[PDB]
Paper text:
The core version of the CBC is a heterotrimer of the subunits HapB, HapC, and [name] that binds the [name] box, a promoter element present in about 30% of all eukaryotic genes. The two histone-like subunits HapC and [name] associate with the DNA backbone and bend it in a nucleosome-like manner, whereas HapB with its sensor helix αS and its C-terminal anchor inserts into the minor groove and recognizes the [name] box. Depending on the target gene and other transcriptional regulators, the CBC hereby either activates or inhibits gene expression.
To investigate how the [name] mutation in [name] alters the DNA-binding capacity of the CBC and ultimately confers drug resistance, we attempted the crystallization of wt and mutant CBC from [name]. Structures of the Afu_CBC could be solved in complex with double-stranded 23-bp-long DNA fragments derived from the promoter sequences of either cycA (2.6 Å resolution) or cccA (2.3 Å resolution). In addition to our previously determined An_CBC–cycA crystal structure, we also obtained data on the An_CBC in complex with the cccA DNA fragment (2.2 Å resolution). As visualized by the wt Afu_CBC–cccA and wt Afu_CBC–cycA complex structures, these conserved amino acid variations cause a slight shift of the N-terminal αN helix of [name] that might enhance mobility and prevent crystallization in the absence of a high-affinity DNA ligand. Likewise, in the absence of nucleic acid, Afu_CBC did not crystallize.
Author numbering:
A (entry chain A): 234 to 259, 264 to 290
B (entry chain C): 58 to 164
C (entry chain B): 39 to 130
Write the structure that this text describes.
DNA sequence: AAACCCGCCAATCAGATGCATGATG
DNA sequence: TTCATCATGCATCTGATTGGCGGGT
């Protein structure tokens, strides 16, 4: 059981994704160091909600 | 108006909204620049038409919505009101249209 | 080409999911991530099919009808035919 | 019981959008 | 030659990213 319409394109994508892992060789808790810091630094209510300056 | 009943009429409503409601071809739920970056991630892809990410913007909106509603049905059957990853995994296995996601969502 | 260029932003995906569910519903973070990965592959999967057809026909631009043709070829006929109506409106 | 974990909040700044230019067919 | 439409670079400014807590799961 494989979708005959998608079979060839699935294996084309599997090889393509394998190249891209090899190339991008190097998910994270956060994406950006600057925004992570912003959120940690920011003032919060007692509930842990962010608020205005 | 049960979960299975709104999924049954899903494409009827999609086509009604396409035929009636006046669209905004700039404003989307998904940003066009990121859709284009995903397309450009493929080395074989060279140039992309302005129309292509616009079609994907609406296509992906329909896709996320359809799969979310399919996954929600599995959540209701286990009497949970929190949508899990296993609910999406269960939804993919119910239609061979999702066979392309076999490597993305294993088992 | 950044490594996050492969995926759509999780907040935009999570908002569409939220609209598709009843008001009281909750969504797990893994479900948001899973959906982000699925919809991103949806784009890559279809675009790859359209891309290879453009190569064989010696065309550089992946255009609108190439995406619809690919969607039909790969068994997304509901998406192909619905977005064909949507396209004729945009062009109108 | 008792782990587990997702919605709530809004400011910064990564990046999305829109326009001018030159290339391309 | 002209037209339609692409990538690219740049200016403008906008909304995605972000985490501690509590109570629902
Ligand atoms: O069986 S799947 O790998 O096409």
């Amino acid at each position: 059981y494989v979708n005959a319409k998608q079979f060839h394109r699935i294996l084309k994508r599997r090889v393509a994704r394998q190249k891209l892992e090899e190339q991008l060789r190097l998910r994270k808790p956060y994406l950006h160091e600057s925004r992570h810091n912003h959120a940690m630094r920011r003032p919060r209510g007692p509930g842990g909600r962010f608020l205005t300056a | 108006g049960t979960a299975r009943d709104i999924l049954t009429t899903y494409w009827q409503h999609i086509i009604n909204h396409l035929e009636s409601d006046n669209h905004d071809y700039k404003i989307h739920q998904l940003p066009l620049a990121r859709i284009k970056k995903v397309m450009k991630a493929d080395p074989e892809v060279k140039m992309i038409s302005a129309e292509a990410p616009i079609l994907f913007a609406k296509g992906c909106d329909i896709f996320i919505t359809e799969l979310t509603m399919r996954a929600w049905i599995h959540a209701e059957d286990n009497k949970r009101r929190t949508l899990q990853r296993s609910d999406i995994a269960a939804a993919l296995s119910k239609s061979d249209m999702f066979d392309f996601l076999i490597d993305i969502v294993p088992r | 080409m950044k490594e996050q260029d492969r995926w759509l932003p999780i907040a935009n995906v999570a908002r569409i999911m939220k609209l598709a569910l009843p008001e009281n519903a909750k969504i797990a973070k893994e479900a948001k991530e899973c959906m982000q990965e699925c919809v991103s592959e949806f784009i890559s999967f279809i675009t790859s099919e359209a891309s290879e057809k453009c190569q064989q026909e010696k065309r550089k631009t992946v255009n609108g009808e190439d995406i619809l043709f690919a969607m039909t070829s790969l068994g997304f006929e509901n998406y192909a035919e619905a977005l064909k109506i949507y396209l004729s409106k945009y062009r109108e």
